[PDB]
Design an enzyme around this catalytic site. Sequence first.
Site: not given
Ligand code: FAD
Ligand code: TRP
Ligand code: CL
Lengths: 517, 517
Positions: B348, B78, B14, B453
């Site tokens: 995240g 949501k 992402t 925020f």
């Molecule tokens: C348990 C959990 C729950 C979450 N829940 C939420 C949520 O409800 N809502 C939300 O908004 N966010 C959530 N997040 C955060 C969200 O999942 C991440 O912010 C988001 O998906 C982005 O991840 P990323 O791309 O930084 O890393 P990653 O998904 O770990 O991607 C890493 C990328 O880098 C690559 N890579 C790594 N090393 C190398 C290398 N050596 N060479 C080439 N490629 C490499 C991998 O191949 C991959 O493509 C959650 C995170 C976790 C851990």
């Molecule tokens: N300013 C953010 C605050 C926020 C983050 N996570 C949330 C979850 C539920 C309600 C509000 C939030 C929003 O309204 O989007």
């Molecule tokens: Cl999150």
Amino acid sequence: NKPIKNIVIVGGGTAGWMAASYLVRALQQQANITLIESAAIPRIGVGEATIPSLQKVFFDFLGIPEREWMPQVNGAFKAAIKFVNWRKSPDPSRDDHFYHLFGNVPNCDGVPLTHYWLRKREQGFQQPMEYACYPQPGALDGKLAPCLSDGTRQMSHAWHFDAHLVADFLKRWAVERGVNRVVDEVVDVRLNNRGYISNLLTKEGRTLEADLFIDCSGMRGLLINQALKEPFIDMSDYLLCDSAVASAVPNDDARDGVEPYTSSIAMNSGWTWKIPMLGRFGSGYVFSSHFTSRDQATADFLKLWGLSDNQPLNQIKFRVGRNKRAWVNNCVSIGLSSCFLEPLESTGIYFIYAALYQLVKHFPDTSFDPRLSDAFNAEIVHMFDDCRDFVQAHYFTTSRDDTPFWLANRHDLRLSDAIKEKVQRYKAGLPLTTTSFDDSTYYETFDYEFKNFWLNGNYYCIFAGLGMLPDRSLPLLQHRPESIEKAEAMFASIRREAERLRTSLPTNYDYLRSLRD
Amino acid sequence: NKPIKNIVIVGGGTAGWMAASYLVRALQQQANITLIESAAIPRIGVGEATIPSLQKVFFDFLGIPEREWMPQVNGAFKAAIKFVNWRKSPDPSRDDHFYHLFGNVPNCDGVPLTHYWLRKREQGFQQPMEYACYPQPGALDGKLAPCLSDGTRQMSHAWHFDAHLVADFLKRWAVERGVNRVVDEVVDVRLNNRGYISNLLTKEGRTLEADLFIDCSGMRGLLINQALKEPFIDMSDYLLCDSAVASAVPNDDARDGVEPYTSSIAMNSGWTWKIPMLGRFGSGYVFSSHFTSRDQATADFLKLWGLSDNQPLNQIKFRVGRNKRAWVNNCVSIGLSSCFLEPLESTGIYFIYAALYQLVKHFPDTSFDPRLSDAFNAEIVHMFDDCRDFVQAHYFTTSRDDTPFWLANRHDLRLSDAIKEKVQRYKAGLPLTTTSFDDSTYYETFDYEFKNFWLNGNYYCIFAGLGMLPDRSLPLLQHRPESIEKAEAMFASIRREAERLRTSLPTNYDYLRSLRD
Ligand SMILES: Cc1cc2nc3c(=O)[nH]c(=O)nc-3n(C[C@H](O)[C@H](O)[C@H](O)COP(=O)(O)OP(=O)(O)OC[C@H]3O[C@@H](n4cnc5c(N)ncnc54)[C@H](O)[C@@H]3O)c2cc1C
Ligand SMILES: N[C@@H](Cc1c[nH]c2ccccc12)C(=O)O
Ligand SMILES: [Cl-]
Ligand SMILES: Cc1cc2nc3c(=O)[nH]c(=O)nc-3n(C[C@H](O)[C@H](O)[C@H](O)COP(=O)(O)OP(=O)(O)OC[C@H]3O[C@@H](n4cnc5c(N)ncnc54)[C@H](O)[C@@H]3O)c2cc1C
Ligand SMILES: N[C@@H](Cc1c[nH]c2ccccc12)C(=O)O
Ligand SMILES: [Cl-]
């Protein structure tokens, strides 16, 4: 085999104190009984309605007469449940009520009066079944007591009482008879490698051991579900309600009297109980969170009684169903830890003392012969599933179609083979279980009542009240004109008794007051 | 100074594809963008929940309307997070839920309705704050859509979606707009003598050069942490969870509906998210390995959803905290390479597009003026630490004491001066940040939202929901009875809106289906 010597009951609600008291009485010698209850975890007590076996099976067993326990729990009298607005979509211009009365309908030449009543209805007779077949409903309309002023019983009845006070009363009774009470909280349960409970670890660092554990921990099923992992059979496919919002509402007894019955007032997405005692009534809107929100349902409950946004409320959730097995290894579940059915027919406290009766009937030694627990478990399954079906029959037989909730009840429920079969016999015009026992005999013969808990009169009160009648009267009656005339004389006697009750009974309010505020 | 011409993004999760797409859009001319992602190293995508700025800051910037991206990611709606069993030790007989809603609480004569609600509560008012102050919670209880059937928005909302599908969607979008994609793995990073990234050496023997490197490598922080040695500030003293066990669970949508909110279900040693979409929900038990083992926590997660020992699981670990600096020399970290906070408040993905927004706002030339990166770094620190504190306030304010984990949260956390100060103002009865902006204005003004925020309504949803209320209502209100009466009219309007939503919104399941399976 060594007898059970040490028993630990977890839980100090109605179930735990009924367990403590029943077991201390049943186990005259050789038993040491300890009950542990948390000061931090509240009991369930809403304002509770009961059935006649409470005295006959429970208090009589303890040797406690009605006049001893009633005043200490601010008891009041219950002669029926009155169902309001259940029959079809409510109209405020129409009186939609019917009673489900305690007691057996008389037979005339081997056929219950319900069936002669139906033949009359086929010929245009307008009187509702329960007013024709029982002497007391008009007296309940007039809010009359179940007894003459001198205490002479005039109809079968049971009680409404303060459920906390009942628990308290039994606590005092049991402790005085040698029950060891521990105020503490069980935090862990250790099982041996075979899966039996070894001990309970508590918050204050006590380790409790026993030969036999009684789980009265309430809906959490601390031992039976959480430690022993006995599956709970969720029956939300049979019955839709999963929530209640409850309170006590003050009553103007001097102006309005005290109704000698529980009411079940059908709502949009469930039904509201009313449980009168002196000075107030317990009430709760039992609802399905799938069809209404707690906030909406709370608005409704308050609107129903003209109550204020300031009225504090007992907000409840529940799972409908029962454990796959009530007694597993060395643990017997009793009360909310064992099962739950919504309070539509006042079976909750019944399930406690009926289960306790069966426990003593199947009482183990320290070897825990699985043949005993198997037999006990089977009795509990019959008891529960039979009541579940009876309650469910109030829902699937309704003609209400005005809300999503009522439509779901008419169309979307899963029905047992057993209840389908009963409905089929009823619709064919056949009586359900009848007995020639009078009420005294029935209510004094628990082995009979336990297996024959809903009789023909009970089914007829509900089905006729809800407006589902058989396809036809009993073909046999076409051959028996003398019997039909005999039944007429019996209906005449019932009417005479009703008129005598009208002018002979004190009001329930007056009688309760004479027993004393 | 020469502009940035070549940009290399490491990572195809992402974060990397959001980076690619945001930068390709922002940098209309003169930029060449390459993204390298390993086929061998999986992305993080659990089933993800978001907040309204995702559309306003990210997709609107790209020019992609909701109706274009939603179907391609199997998006669902949501409207809140619903916190379950957070308030005190769970009891299965009690409904412990509260909502944290999107959107601002209205003001009445310069004072938020939260504060009039509190004054009512002092006088016995029983309704929970969010049901009094927001029109939508009862609709969420009824699993209703955030829009009328014709798509007219009825409440502020965001999305649940398949996070892999989001990455895929943006991959396609970015590549089509000139982003060069390389499927390969970076194995070494060369720095010049000054400490700037010169090049990346890959497994297939490619040498990648750029003016600007974006580290989207995920938690390993391949460039920012491993090559550049930027310290990660471990914040496990602020927050205890470090692990998740996650899966998708099939949902019976036709029977059970699709909940239009994320749930946070407090567990023994953490909490379980539930993220509904059509056909299934993403779930994960976020836990602290210090208080429970992965094996135990896995038992719990399976027990919670009645899942089998055969259910394959996404086992995760994480470090809570953030880099000391997000952008060092010619490398900007975005996503999990920059920071992590447990998903308690869905921040995240916000951190990704908020950081990207700030990157473009502080965009460098090839000279890398440290004044730009310093300013950017400061914004990221504010953003992260502010959210960390907000999340932490869910933990230290809880009344749960039933496990070691909950006790640690009540007693053992390190609190920032900033959060102590906010709690102090709240307890004194003072509002936190309020605005007279409506939701449209707030969510369209990111420079405002980014620095403001969490508003008063956000803090009140959490603190009131958890049962920590101010010592008293605002002293000012004692002087303003006309204002108090004005607020009553506003509460009445909210109730009217709630009742209108109840009968006007389609179910979330029905609406999502009408958008199409
Ligand atoms: C348990 C959990 C729950 C979450 N829940 C939420 C949520 O409800 N809502 C939300 O908004 N966010 C959530 N997040 C955060 C969200 O999942 C991440 O912010 C988001 O998906 C982005 O991840 P990323 O791309 O930084 O890393 P990653 O998904 O770990 O991607 C890493 C990328 O880098 C690559 N890579 C790594 N090393 C190398 C290398 N050596 N060479 C080439 N490629 C490499 C991998 O191949 C991959 O493509 C959650 C995170 C976790 C851990
Ligand atoms: N300013 C953010 C605050 C926020 C983050 N996570 C949330 C979850 C539920 C309600 C509000 C939030 C929003 O309204 O989007
Ligand atoms: Cl999150
Ligand atoms: C809404 C509703 C309406 C009802 N209406 C009726 C009615 O009209 N008529 C009727 O007959 N019945 C009715 N019932 C059923 C009736 O209330 C119960 O059968 C009865 O009161 C017994 O409850 P209990 O003792 O099993 O559980 P509870 O009252 O829940 O008691 C549980 C006990 O276990 C303790 N406990 C739990 N965990 C621990 C632990 N970890 N360590 C130590 N102690 C622990 C608690 O402290 C408490 O003492 C109704 C029930 C409900 C929910
Ligand atoms: N055999 C039970 C049947 C029963 C249960 N709940 C009831 C309510 C009303 C009338 C009868 C019942 C009794 O007569 O007590
Ligand atoms: Cl009951």
